[PDB]
Each structure stands twice: as C-alpha cells, then as structure tokens.
Amino acid sequence: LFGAIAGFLENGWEGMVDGWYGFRHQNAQGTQAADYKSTQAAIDQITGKLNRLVEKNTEFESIESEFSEIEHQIGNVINWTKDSITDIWTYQAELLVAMENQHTIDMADSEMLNLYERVRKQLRQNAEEDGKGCFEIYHACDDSCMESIRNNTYDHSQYREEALLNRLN
C-alpha cells in the first residue's frame, strides 16, 4: 500500500471519465484534466495480466466411459485422481486472482503516488502540500501556468524568489 488511494487522497472523482489519474485547478478565472502517461502506465499493466491469463492447451482424451459401466476399482482410482486434480486447480485459481487482485490494486496505488511525487519535485520550493493531494502554490498561476504544471514543463526558477518570500510572510 502506497498511501494515495484509500489513503491520504479522500475519494475518487466520478467526473473524470477522461482517464484514470488527473489534475484539478484552483485559480482566479479558472477551474479539470486527466493525465495520459500515468493512466496508460496502469492500463498497459492490466492488459498485461489479461494477456497472460488467456494463454494456451494439452489435448486430453476420455478415460471414463459415460455410457457403459467400468470396473469398480479402476473407477475409484480415476475418481480420486480427477478429484485431487480439481482440488489443485481450484486452489491454484483462487490463489491466482487473489494475489493478482492484490497486486493490481496496490499497483494503481503506486501509479497515483508517482504522479504526485513527480509534481511535488517539480513545484519544488514554490509550493507546499496540503496533505489531501493538493499543492498550495504560493504565487499566481494562470491557466497557461497550470497547463505547464500538467505538462512537466513548469520552470520553478521563474517564480522561486517571489514564491519564497511569500511562504515566509
């Protein structure tokens, strides 16, 4: 468990049908976007699991007859084997989706935290964390500036000194 989902982030956004992971504005004149790379980064791992799941098959033939009687003792050996082979495949299959669902869940988590940290490291000193997923940006950020934040092209040096004394007053 990486802290973001069912963690420090309070809840999901239903209005965001655009992608798995996203940004929300707060500024004068403006207010949503979804991140492309971070959602593909998660979908491409889901369809990775799925492609493994549908892999294949050994050919088997019939070893108990459906329309005739077959010797009692050989019939008991065959019932026992198949039953044991099924107890196994049933165990193997309840284990598979279990540990798969654990990884899937904890991984989506992971990709959310990586978006969060990516942005955190980028705003650098110009901003601080509110602890609910948001960064309070101690300077003015118009819609172009917020685009650039979602763009990974935000230059923190531009605003650092104005932002810094703003954090201190």
């Binding site: 107890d87 049933t90 598979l96 669902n101």
Partner: peptide, 28 residues
C-alpha cells in the same frame, strides 16, 4: 464439467472468480 475431452480449460469447482481490472473504488 469435470469430465471433458480435447483442448479444454481446466475444471474448477467454483461459480465465479473475479479479476480486478482497475483501481480501488473510493466514492464520495
């Protein structure tokens, strides 16, 4: 059926096994 022939999927004694394909659902 626990009793098949040819190239079959493996028989498991369960009605359903759901495989997550997305994140945890956390609504408002």
């Amino acid at each position: 059926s626990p009793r098949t022939v040819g190239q079959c999927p493996k028989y498991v004694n369960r009605r359903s096994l759901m495989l997550a394909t997305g994140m945890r659902n956390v609504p408002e």
